[PDB]
Design a protein around this ligand. Structure first.
Ligand SMILES: *[C@@H]1O[C@H](CO)[C@@H](O)[C@H](O)[C@H]1NC(C)=O
Ligand SMILES: *[C@@H]1O[C@H](CO)[C@@H](O)[C@H](O)[C@H]1NC(C)=O
Ligand SMILES: *[C@@H]1O[C@H](CO)[C@@H](O)[C@H](O)[C@H]1NC(C)=O
Ligand SMILES: *[C@@H]1O[C@H](CO)[C@@H](O)[C@H](O)[C@H]1NC(C)=O
Ligand SMILES: *[C@@H]1O[C@H](CO)[C@@H](O)[C@H](O)[C@H]1NC(C)=O
Ligand SMILES: *[C@@H]1O[C@H](CO)[C@@H](O)[C@H](O)[C@H]1NC(C)=O
Lengths: 316, 171, 171, 316, 171, 316
């Protein structure tokens, strides 16, 4: 009489790799690298702001594309390729640092700084910043000499940070298309904007000149910023060519910012994003996008790495 | 192999054993029959499952962008970021390929272990009433009916019950 | 288990064996007695100790600050530094958790090995004068006094001394 | 008769993790991640400088807090939270780069640059830099017009690096509180400081104006620096608002710089520091401070990772 | 050892066995003779070779300079680059030292496995016609000429041919 | 009678390390860390440019050292220690970033930007850029006032990137030795160069003043750059002190750039370089140069790590 010991097998096992072999058939195996993308921003359970045409930095200055987001509040912030920080052409100095701050900010709360003015106009506009016709950056004020070619009176304006949180303060320096047009807006002679907190002292001269047309205009307003700590004052000393802030920005809490080219979807829930969508996976590795962000599997080069979940397959 | 059982002295496995990973196949008076051993199966599954629970798990480390896909960052810092990222990608690709290779070698060896473990448990239950045939089978040198086979499987077989019968038959 | 001995065919270990990791427990005419096997113990300790000497060791790699806790660095470079650091922390946390898990799996399997190694050494010393009972014991089929047991332990037992006695007793 | 093989066990083993299980009891285990801090800077066997109230950059300029450290020499340099680089308010431009240099420097050796002056005062002081009453930065000279509102004569001063090592050269630019007070100290008109070596050409204009009081003063002296190579000359062309160096700084050797909030202790010896003290450990990993420096175990997230030093514990 | 064969119950190996990793050494009527087992050798070589093919392999990941050896970069970014590089060097030095140690421990254990595998294959071929002597040898309890030894080696030995001869000789 | 099992051994095995032991003799082992350098740049099968005395950045501006490489084409670019980007003393601003670009570029193709000029000279030269006597940067134009002290007319010049690839645009700013000599070359008053694309707005003032002689001259021309995308325009507004580009540079494809002190060798083929030569190895690790580049083994600290290729060696 007799008894035999043995073990299972299947006609078609799965090939996997070992220390000693490439491609040994085992019974069952499973994938360890995620390749399955969900091609939408899985926004369920988070206050999501799709910035569309509003460039994230525009939330501070407030060109018209950004009117809905001037005091935005969010857990997830989505920047789009069509976004622009800007109506009257220009750029932010130290731009990417500020985006990194704002992406993290939870959104922004605005306070008036309460600058009032006399002996100047307070209301320059342009047809590149359209609302009901020629307007400007909503949070700023284009300060002009009272009438064409008039002297701009040497001014000082100061804002104390009343609040518990530190504040983002913005200003612009207008680089007019010609020394002609500079004189026309703010009068003749040297133009000096000086700015200081206690942490910060610096100085700006406009530098007028032709540059290629953007929204039809050849002038530029480059924007500057500083972080003004609680109970500290910021003081603007200036005689023209100065784009004054009306409102300071304060951060609300925390957020995560992504850049994406695909639709929001408040019905799918996820924590790892890239521009092509969301990565929902318990797997330890992903081969989808090396730049993905949030709480993600680790990017690896390899498309597949199979982990054996059964013994050697030994058929007949 | 390691352990030498699967793909070793047990030439090939069984496509018809479908209630388990390891099992018995007897032949006696009433005829052939096949049954899976739960305990050795559950031991292997539990251990492989444990590897799975250890890898299929939540990184709670948040990362944020340092880079910009739309309006590209300064070339110098960008090149450092890119160099730094690529360096880390190398590390994880290596760490991942090795993990899997090492885990797989162990998973194969572990399943081989549970086979050897079961074979040697039975060998011991049979004391001097059987002989190893070399291929994974025991020549049971005494009559072993369907109830007796069941005793071998559920680990109740009393060798001193059949010893005298078998001693004799072995000569 | 792997190897199948500890937490396997040797159901449980001994709280009273205090001079070693492995040992013998006999029963004869003069009564029960327990003694540790030095050589197999020292083999395991030496090997585990070797893992310890390999980890408990000096990184000679100097690192310097790139960062500043009092007056914080520029936000962009700071975010890169923080990203870079956090990325490396992930790597070492992974490397550390895996090392320990892998080392521990091996340490358990290694201790299991030295048990199987010792059981099978004794089995071989006993030739055809004993039988495996299945639980870690040998039925010694001849009279084996406290001097004889000591011969088994210190690896001097001559099987041909008791063979005729035992052959006979086995039937 | 009978003989039994077996193995030790204990009533209370230690749980550890494996490839296949979480929390298996083994006989003995040991910790692999260091958590034990020594809450003092273990300075034994190295020349240690505790900068206290002297900000590391102050060692170059020499405000009073730094008088003991003007030619300091060290293997380990400890910056404190109370340190300040400064008496008359201001900041260093490109500050963190310079700290990284100085932390590594082994200390500093000073040479006179041998500037003498005529047709100006050479001795401006202030009550923010107190010694026996109003003084200044020890290594610098506050150059003033001879008398209130007098012209500052257009000057040129040059220092050649005579030495084998490259040199740190410092200067300051005084930003007066108003165009009034600028005229008072250095006379009227545009103020220009130009600076050049062979590697370097650059230019500094003061930027006077109101800003909040710091140590009661609203003026500012921001400090600048360059590295002057062997046999190269540095040339200062200026007409006022200029804080001239008296002495150049040279690096002595090597050092390691830390930032810390705890006491020195020359009886305990260590090579891994963080602000909370010293990490003395042969363990491969540490969960104490991710920013720690010197020769350290690797920072890991996990508080504990136990390494089995014994077999499976299998009791009754 | 693990597996317990090499540097274990087989005290030491053979400088004269040069056609293989494992082999047989017999003693009979015609005299002593030594021959290598191809199959067990080729099993070990194939497996070690596989480890070699896995490491001796092309990283195709390009890296570029971020640094400058002639005109040194800005001190702050340079210090970050240097910190980042040194951190990754730590990682690879660790990964490399561990790989080798882990691979080596496995390579030794694997070669030990193939020895145990071969010993236990022979043990089984011999059924009840031989006895384990404890040192790696079988006391073949029947006359086994150069043709018969060859049958043991090439795995054709029929135990029932010599069983009656050996049963008898064992007493 | 008897049969014995066994295993091979050798009189002198090789010591290797394991998890559990340091230095166990095994039969055969092999090295896993490469130490063998080939002390030449193994250039076989790739179009290789040894820049010799031409500094890589000089390929854009075209001082005389670089006349052969103005439109160079390559798979591998070798910079030498003797290379210089420059004839008239000066530096590139943001220099290392531009090298990283050019090392990767495959070489460069030049287009004319087609600036013509009236009311100025277009032909400043210097005896620091010698060809057949006093010349200049081949790709640039030293723009001067018509005659000593004449006004430099406020100009605007623009180049559209007509092409498919993005373009490298260079300009220089001349820093004259004194306000005297600046007035002499370009006339009186403030000098402003402004530059802008749509991605870029920035502004440059010369900064005249005394500095030591380099190649006998005390002036300086620092060079600046930007990357101008397809269909985008770059606009130069300026009134003197400006070194104008004649030609833009376009990248050809891909390359790998190294810095090296050793000979080219077109007979040996390799993909991992460092300054000391080439690393040709299938081994996974190398202990040769931590900074090596291309397709390399990984740098590790350890000089040797031996991988066992045989069993334990157990003699008698
Ligand atoms: C701000 O100012 C007032 C002093 O008037 C003080 O009471 C308050 O606590 C200050 N705190 C901070 C954090 O600025
Ligand atoms: C960085 O990497 C991305 C893709 O991973 C690439 O598209 C980008 O241009 C690279 N940046 C630089 C500065 O080379
Ligand atoms: C980076 O993290 C540190 C703690 O590691 C924090 O104190 C610091 O301010 C963080 N970075 C930024 C960019 O704010
Ligand atoms: C510095 O100055 C003099 C030349 O007049 C000389 O003896 C010394 O060697 C010089 N060399 C360098 C590299 O500084
Ligand atoms: C960075 O690394 C190299 C050593 O590999 C060294 O020669 C270089 O000058 C270091 N840089 C700094 C800033 O310490
Ligand atoms: C450039 O110009 C023409 C339109 O005037 C157009 O066909 C072409 O697609 C443009 N696009 C790009 C990416 O240059």
């Amino acid at each position: 009489d007799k008894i035999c010991l043995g073990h299972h097998a299947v006609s078609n096992g799965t090939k996997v790799n070992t220390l000693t072999e490439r491609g040994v058939e085992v019974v069952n195996a499973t994938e360890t690298v995620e390749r399955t993308n969900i091609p939408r921003i899985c926004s369920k359970g988070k206050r999501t702001v799709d910035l569309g045409q509003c460039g994230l930095l525009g939330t501070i200055t407030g060109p018209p594309q950004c009117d809905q987001f001037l005091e935005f509040s969010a857990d997830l912030i989505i920047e789009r390729r069509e976004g622009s920080d800007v109506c009257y052409p220009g750029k932010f100095v130290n731009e990417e640092a500020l985006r990194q701050i704002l992406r993290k900010s939870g959104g922004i709360d605005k306070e008036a700084m309460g600058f009032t003015y006399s002996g100047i106009r307070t209301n320059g506009a342009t047809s590149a910043c359209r609302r009901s016709g020629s307007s400007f950056y909503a949070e700023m004020k284009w300060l002009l000499s009272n009438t064409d070619n008039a002297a701009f009176p040497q001014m000082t304006k100061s804002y104390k940070n009343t609040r518990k949180s530190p504040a983002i303060i913005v200003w612009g320096i207008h680089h007019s298309v010609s020394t002609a047009e500079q004189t026309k807006l703010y009068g003749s002679g040297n133009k000096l904007v000086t700015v200081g907190s206690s942490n910060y002292q610096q100085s700006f001269v406009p530098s007028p000149g032709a540059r290629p047309q953007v929204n039809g205009l050849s002038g530029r307003i480059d924007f500057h910023w500083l972080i003004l700590n609680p109970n500290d004052t910021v003081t603007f000393s200036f005689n023209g060519a100065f784009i004054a802030p009306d409102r300071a920005s304060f951060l609300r809490g925390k957020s995560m910012g992504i850049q994406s080219g695909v639709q929001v979807d408040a019905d799918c829930e996820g924590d790892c994003y890239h521009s092509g969508g969301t990565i929902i996976s318990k797997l330890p590795f992903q081969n989808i996008d090396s730049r993905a962000v949030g709480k993600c599997p680790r990017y690896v080069k390899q498309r597949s790495l199979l982990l054996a979940t059964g013994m050697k397959n030994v058929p007949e | 192999g390691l352990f030498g059982a699967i793909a070793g002295f047990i030439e090939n496995g069984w496509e018809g054993l479908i209630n388990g990973w390891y099992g018995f196949r007897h032949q006696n008076a009433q005829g052939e029959g096949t049954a899976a051993d739960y305990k050795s199966t559950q031991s292997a599954i539990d251990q492989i499952t444990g590897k799975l629970n250890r890898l299929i798990e939540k990184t709670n480390q948040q990362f944020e962008l340092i880079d910009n896909e739309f309006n590209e960052v300064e070339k110098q810092i960008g090149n450092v970021i890119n160099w730094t990222r690529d360096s880390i990608t190398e590390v994880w690709s290596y760490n991942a390929e090795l993990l899997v290779a090492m885990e797989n070698q162990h998973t194969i060896d572990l399943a081989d272990s549970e086979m050897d473990k079961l074979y040697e448990r039975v060998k011991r239950q049979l004391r001097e009433n059987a002989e190893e045939d070399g291929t994974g089978c025991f020549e049971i040198f005494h009559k072993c009916d369907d109830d007796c086979m069941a005793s071998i499987r559920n680990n109740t077989y009393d060798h001193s019950k059949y010893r005298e019968e078998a001693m004799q038959n072995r000569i």
